[PDB]
Symmetry: D3
Subunit: 175 residues, 6 copies
């Protein structure tokens, strides 16, 4: 029951990300349906691009855009869809699309799971190649879709990311 | 909760297919257990064949054969097991086995998901190679199983497929 | 709902194993969270090893170590995570770690699913190469993890395995 | 070896394409070394894109960019690197990169290999999606490479492609 | 290159098999070009079947079908195309196709490579499943190919296989 | 062919590595046959381990173990067997096996191929995890092979690696 997974052990620095799409996956956009807790296909992108890292959501959050908060999680190996990963937020990729807000958080595995990300404390600590690859992916994977687009704005720090988690958690908690 | 996924947005022309087996999967027959909503292994086929396309079921349907209605869904890339795909029915592959009825519906992704199947309105619009590959797969994947077989009868149109969806939906709705 | 899957059709000789990790998977240790029925990432191992066979648990069991009873299931092809496989227990791999008991049961697909394991009645019937590969995997996959280790003790017969299933089933049934 | 392979059975209508990169390969750009007849790694691209179809060359040809003529070949399943495919040229994607000419022809498997492309006689017969995908891939796969770029001029017909095969074949012979 | 490889260390008991197609490969039939020593795509099969084991040839041999002797080789993991495996012939699958003779020998890896097949001394020692799978694959992989067919006469012993290796080896030498 | 490839552009700082085994490959140990220039299967390991990175050799070299110098090369994506990668040697893993010398150098892709390793100038610059993973893999992949063993003496610097490239290059020339 994905629907009974906690938002985190100690929000907002210690969170749980439920994986929707694994790293290196084909360009099929999936989305969690909170009514059923089932993953629905959104769209089969026409571009020849693959997901640069894992993509999931924080359960029990309500982003202003209506969906839970989405998170990009880089890992040693691709994660199983539906698995829950303990992470630590490090930044946010600010973007917009024809529909409005589309920011995505970036988080790294918690030290209990792996020791290789212990030194990534903020968005500026992530490899420059990884950040460029992620931003490029989002800017272009919808290129061949008519009436759809994505404008990538920039990166924001961990503090920005944490503000968003606590705000979205409360936005569903008290509502 | 696969069990809370609707049968469709607008039956029978607009349905939801819950994927059980992805396209190109190894010859392991899986089946949904409606008691638990969990996928159980049915049999490991001994033939060297792979699934020609995705295989799923329409939730909230009761085929006369006892199970939900099964659907074959061809896609640009293989779908994740347990994901829900919005489709449009285009035909049916009539078959029987030692146990009785074994017809399988064929449906294509809804236009909202992809624009490449918009021109496939009926079973006769599907590529002739695809239809031959699907029929051949079902006729032969159980070849090396003792006391089991499949006799493929032929293809029926979208109207036949739609009659089956509404009949099976009601057969579980009012029962 | 993995949580509603029966422990077995006829315990302890006829059981159901819910798959957590498929055969040949990368070294990411997953674990079932019985609160949510969701799979959580435990650890990303640093070794260059892969799972020699499928790894799952028997639902409705309570091993003394706190978790459900874990089972290793060898199959013709890798199983889908979350799928339920009907098996017959044939032995147990006795092991310990820094945390205590860590025995893992070994079971083969039930004859209804496949006929290739019908002649494996006990732990001594399994291929000698398979047993060595499994024991070696467990002895070494945690090698590069600080403060963690596994000491593989030896193999025990089907009778030992069956005693453990009935004991663990009752340990959760009457508690 | 791969240097004893003809440019074709009957240039320019009947050609042989030696595969260098399989369809769906990761973004590692390879280049044939004319002297060794060995495949050299040229560059690891930083974008998250995969090769939209098989990429190869016509042996015994020398295009303006100094390498043999390169050909993109669509197939049902990805081809093995180094295998030779009998094809029919159907068009060319005109482009220039930071170094000069960079045209890629497009050829389909010969009818003896598969009837599936028998109808593709010219550039306008190819699927619009595939053409969009190929152009988009070449337009952007080098986006994150400093100093590297690709200007896409557009598609040209079978006749333009056949003229390049003839000119390039003679350019390698009359040398 | 691959043309400087011996037919074997000690024909016909000790042979070398150059791999053309890996175990589990898609249904693309390849054929070695004797003059180039290059692998040519021969046909894309339309059936949904995969190669049951590694498929190769004995260099410096010429069977009746005009190609070198072909050998099927079972292994723990699929082999790389072009690699040379030291084997022991254990049998032959007698067949004829639309063109004439079409026998395939079966060889197991030599004891220096793996002890796992040391007990397989003859055709009757091979697993019944594997033999069933191989025959079924050759009986049906060309089912959807117009004008193409395969008549399977049956299995023959190691002696029959060794006689073909000797005759084919001499047929290429005394030419 | 692969025998017409230079040992390097400027030994020992600028070398070419011909790939034999891709990163993440199954435990099948291959060995280059100097006379054929063909890859021979040497042994199927029984341990459940995968190659931690690409494994190759420097053409026109002859190390003490009788084979050309072997090199481990880390890359963003696994390389194709037989492709040639321009590298920079950065260290050597000193080891001995049951037969004698068994050192493996470590080289990183040249800056023309990727900027990603430009900072790796010496052995101590490589990630500690990767080095741990490589040593652990060589220490244990032959554990289940009777009579086979590997003693790992430790890492050595770029200078030690360059001295071996020079000595091995001359040992093959002055022969």
């Amino acid at each position: 029951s994905l629907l009974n997974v906690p938002a985190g052990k100690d929000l907002p620095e210690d969170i749980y990300v439920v994986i929707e799409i694994p790293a290196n996956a084909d360009p099929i956009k999936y989305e969690i349906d909170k009514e059923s807790g089932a993953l629905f296909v959104d769209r089969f992108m026409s571009t020849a691009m693959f997901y640069p890292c894992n993509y999931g959501y924080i359960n029990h959050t309500l982003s202003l855009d209506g969906d839970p908060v989405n998170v990009l999680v880089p890992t040693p190996y691709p994660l199983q869809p539906g698995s829950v990963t303990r992470c630590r937020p490090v930044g946010v990729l600010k973007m917009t699309d024809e529909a409005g807000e589309d920011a995505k958080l970036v988080a790294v595995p918690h030290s209990k799971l792996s020791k290789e990300y212990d030194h990534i404390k903020d968005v500026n600590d992530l490899p420059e190649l990884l950040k460029a690859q992620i931003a490029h992916f989002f800017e272009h994977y919808k290129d061949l879709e008519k009436g759809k687009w994505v404008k990538v704005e920039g990166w924001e720090n961990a503090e920005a990311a944490k503000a968003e988690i606590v705000a979205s958690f409360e936005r569903a908690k008290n509502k």
